[PDB]
């Protein structure tokens, strides 16, 4: 579970690492903000989609309980980046500074430099402004930062409410109890780990047999020596068996005794 | 003739003497300029009208050759003040600074402080303006000074042309020659001076007679002693004679011999 938190720490570090330079300009601020805050979010979303074997299971089968799980396991990375970027400021103020109405803002009482200043307005984040505009721009700076931080806090709140609702609904609308669901999760984890390790060992001993068949002898460590001494092997399982293993498994009950996975259904 | 030049020197001195303070303000500049440049002109015009005995002669009679002469002898004082005030600057620029179009003027290229600056425009002559407006206001200052000096030079030119035309017309449309007109002018001057002095002396001796009749003797200097010893007196002329003297005299000719004044017509 801590992998997502490590990824979030890395996301914050990369935020403070790579670069940022607000291109004070009439109409490019909009696009630059949108891209520089969304493209890394999209990349993190893709990364989250990739390393979730549920999607490969699903596409191998080719449902709403699957999409919820996968998108929830994925979207934790883009959200903790969007929030960190909003709360940081200096990325919302860079994109929504041109759109400020120069009529409605109070300061050291002067109307405004002109009716020509829309390219002068959007130049504030680059801190380049005359002394009068210097004392003037703090207002719009603080206002935009205010809007950014408010959106950020509301985003955090909505994400929290959504997570709580998701949990309270998944527990309410599931056929099992919750303790048995914990047992089921432990079983899935243990089965996956044991299957991975056994597959590796079986494959290694098969390869050793193949090589020995060629040279006449195989060179091994003490460990692999034990691995061949204990476990023999003659040939893998047929393709239909592999095909039967893979797939999505919804909880099915044999008579009186439940099954917890497709490999279990292979009893 | 030099009295007008002495009055002009005094006018320039009083211009540089009394005061001037351009009331930088939206709409009072107009009125202040108009008054502070016209009221002294009107006063000088009245003064010129007063000390020209031709007007008293005329009203005593109660004609275009009289009005031309009087208004010409008068208007020399207001014109030499209007011209000195225009050429001086800092009195036209004070009144016609609000009316400058803020759109049509080129400088260090900025549009203009705002569309609120019409009370900021008319504040330039008071030299109170921010640094940007400092480098900006020189343009309107020089432009208004340009307009003032141009109007001044054109006024001088028109006055000169008018004087030349007046002379060339009065000599062309007069019954006499010009040398005899010079003789006539000398005669008017001499007659006025001699009449003034004789009137004074005759009056003084009459008063001396009156006083002596009262006390029994009159105390006098040596000069007045001679004045009574030489010239006797018994009584003034009747009122009809005084009435016959005064009045306007147009050149009338007795048979073969010209008359040059009403007192001369009293031959």
Distance between CA atoms of residues B17 and B124, nearest Å: 24
List of chain B residues whose C-beta atoms are within 8 Å of the C-beta of residue A110: 114
Count the Cβ atoms, other than its own, within 10 Å of residue B79. Answer: 19
**Alpha helices by DSSP H, chain B:** 2-15, 28-50, 53-61, 64-74, 76-88, 131-172, 179-215, 222-230, 239-245, 262-265
Query: Please, are residues B121 and B97 in contact by the beta-carbon 8 Å criterion?
Result: yes
List of chain B residues whose C-beta atoms are within 8 Å of the C-beta of residue A115: 115
Per-residue tokens: B137:
């206001």
Question: End-to-end CA distance of chain A, in Å?
Answer: 31
SS3 A253: strand
From A111's Cα to the closest Cα of chain B, the distance in A is 8
Q: For testing the chain B interface, which of A103, A108, A114 should be mutated: the one with the most B CBs within 10 Å?
A: A114
Nearest residue to B145 via CA among B83, B97, B82, B81: B97
From A109's Cα to the closest Cα of chain B, the distance in A is 13
Measured CB to CB, residues of chain A less than 8 Å from chain B are 110-116
Q: Do B111 and A114 touch (CB under 8 A)?
A: yes
Distance between CA atoms of residues A87 and A51, nearest Å: 28
This PDB structure is determined at a resolution in Å of 3.7
List of chain A residues whose C-beta atoms are within 8 Å of the C-beta of residue B116: 111
Q: For testing the chain A interface, which of B108, B112, B114, B132 should be mutated: the one with the most A CBs within 10 Å?
A: B114
Per-residue tokens: A78:
């883009």
Q: Cα B6 from chain centroid?
A: 12
Q: Which residues contact A116 (CB under 8 A, 6 or more apart)?
A: B111
Distance between CA atoms of residues A264 and A245, nearest Å: 9
The secondary structure of A173-240 as a DSSP string is: T-SS-SHHHHHHHHHHHHHHHHHHHHHHHHHHHHHHHHHHHHHS-----HHHHHHHHH--------HH
Per-residue tokens: A186:
């432990």
List of chain B residues whose C-beta atoms are within 8 Å of the C-beta of residue A108: none
Distance between CA atoms of residues A63 and A248, nearest Å: 10
List of chain A residues whose C-beta atoms are within 8 Å of the C-beta of residue B110: 114
Phi and psi (nearest 5°) for B258? -80, 155
Nearest residue to B24 via CA among B16, B32, B12: B32
Q: Specify the DSSP element, H or E, that contains A135.
A: helix A131-172
List of chain B residues whose C-beta atoms are within 8 Å of the C-beta of residue A112: 114
Give how far Cα B16 sits from Cα of B20, B38, B183, B210, Å.
9, 16, 41, 52
Count the Cβ atoms, other than its own, within 10 Å of residue B181. Answer: 14
Q: Do A112 and B114 touch (CB under 8 A)?
A: yes
From A113's Cα to the closest Cα of chain B, the distance in A is 6
Per-residue tokens: A5:
């938190």
Phi and psi (nearest 5°) for A182? -65, -45
Q: Do B112 and A111 touch (CB under 8 A)?
A: no
Query: Please, are residues A77 and A47 in contact by the beta-carbon 8 Å criterion?
Result: yes
Q: Which residues lie across from B258 on neighbouring strands?
A: B253
Nearest residue to A82 via CA among A163, A148, A164: A148
From B118's Cα to the closest Cα of chain A, the distance in A is 14
List of chain B residues whose C-beta atoms are within 8 Å of the C-beta of residue A116: 111
Experimental method for this entry?
Answer: cryo-EM
Q: Specify the DSSP element, H or E, that contains A146.
A: helix A131-172
Cβ-Cβ contacts under 8 Å between A and B: the total is: 13
What does the DSSP 8-state code read for residue B122?
G
Query: Please, are residues B134 and B112 in contact by the beta-carbon 8 Å criterion?
Result: no
From B111's Cα to the closest Cα of chain A, the distance in A is 8
Nearest residue to A87 via CA among A37, A136, A124: A37
SS3 A260: coil
The secondary structure of A79-119 as a DSSP string is: HHHHHHHHHH-SSSTTTSSTT--TTS--SSS---S-SSTTT
Distance between CA atoms of residues A52 and A45, nearest Å: 11
Count the Cβ atoms, other than its own, within 10 Å of residue A163. Answer: 12
From A25's Cα to the closest Cα of chain B, the distance in A is 19
Query: Please, are residues B63 and B54 in contact by the beta-carbon 8 Å criterion?
Result: no
The owner of tokens 């003084």 is: B204
Distance between CA atoms of residues B125 and B140, nearest Å: 10
Half-sphere exposure of A259 (CA within 13 A, CB side): 14
List of chain A residues whose C-beta atoms are within 8 Å of the C-beta of residue B108: none
B58-64: long-range contacts, CB 8 A cutoff, minimum separation 24: B58/B248, B60/B246, B60/B247, B61/B247, B61/B248
Measured CB to CB, residues of chain B less than 8 Å from chain A are 110-116
Q: Do A111 and B114 touch (CB under 8 A)?
A: yes
Per-residue tokens: B100:
């400058």
Q: Searching chain B, which residue's CA lies closest to the CA of residue A130? A: B132
Phi and psi (nearest 5°) for B226? -60, -40
Q: For testing the chain A interface, which of B103, B108, B111 should be mutated: the one with the most A CBs within 10 Å?
A: B111
* Sign of the CA dihedral with A170 first, then A173, A179, and A182 last: negative
List of chain B residues whose C-beta atoms are within 8 Å of the C-beta of residue A111: 114, 116
Task: Kindly report the three-state secondary structure assignment for every residue of B135-202.
Answer: HHHHHHHHHHHHHHHHHHHHHHHHHHHHHHHHHHHHHHCCCCCCHHHHHHHHHHHHHHHHHHHHHHHH
From A138's Cα to the closest Cα of chain B, the distance in A is 21
Q: For testing the chain A interface, which of B113, B117, B118, B133 should be mutated: the one with the most A CBs within 10 Å?
A: B113
Q: Searching chain B, which residue's CA lies closest to the CA of residue A112? A: B114
From B114's Cα to the closest Cα of chain A, the distance in A is 5
Nearest residue to A163 via CA among A80, A58, A41: A80
Query: Please, are residues B83 and B152 in contact by the beta-carbon 8 Å criterion?
Result: yes
Give how far Cα B151 sits from Cα of B39, B76, B77, Å.
19, 18, 18
Query: Please, are residues B84 and B153 in contact by the beta-carbon 8 Å criterion?
Result: no
Count the Cβ atoms, other than its own, within 10 Å of residue B74. Answer: 21
List of chain B residues whose C-beta atoms are within 8 Å of the C-beta of residue A118: none
List of chain A residues whose C-beta atoms are within 8 Å of the C-beta of residue B115: 115
């Amino acid at each position: 579970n801590g992998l997502v938190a490590l990824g979030t720490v890395g996301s914050q570090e990369l935020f403070s690492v790579v670069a940022f330079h607000c291109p004070c300009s009439p109409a490019r601020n909009y696009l630059y903000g949108l891209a520089a805050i969304g493209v890394p979010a999209l990349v993190l979303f893709i990364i989250g989609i990739i390393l979730n074997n549920h999607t490969w299971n699903l596409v191998a089968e080719c449902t709403f309980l699957l999409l919820s799980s996968i998108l929830g396991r994925a979207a934790v990375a883009p959200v903790t980046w969007s929030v960190i970027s909003l709360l940081r400021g200096e990325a919302y103020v860079c994109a929504l500074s041109e759109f400020v109405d120069p009529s409605s803002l109070t300061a050291r009482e002067e109307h405004f430099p002109s009716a020509h200043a829309t390219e002068i307005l959007a130049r504030f984040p680059c801190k380049e402004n005359p002394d009068n505009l210097s004392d003037f721009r703090e207002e719009v700076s603080r206002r935009l930062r205010y809007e950014s931080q408010l959106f950020g806090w509301l985003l955090i709140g909505v994400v929290a409410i959504l997570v709580f609702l998701t949990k309270c609904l998944k527990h309410y609308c599931s056929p099992l109890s919750y303790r048995q669901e914990a047992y089921w999760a432990q079983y899935r984890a243990n089965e996956d780990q044991l299957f991975q390790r056994t597959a590796e060992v079986h494959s290694r001993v098969l390869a050793a047999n193949n090589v020995r068949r060629f040279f006449g002898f195989v060179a091994l460590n003490k460990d692999d020596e034990e691995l061949i001494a204990n476990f023999p092997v003659e040939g893998t399982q047929p393709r239909p068996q592999w095909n039967a293993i893979t797939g999505v498994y919804l909880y099915r009950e044999n008579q009186g005794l439940p099954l917890y996975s497709r490999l279990h259904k292979w009893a």
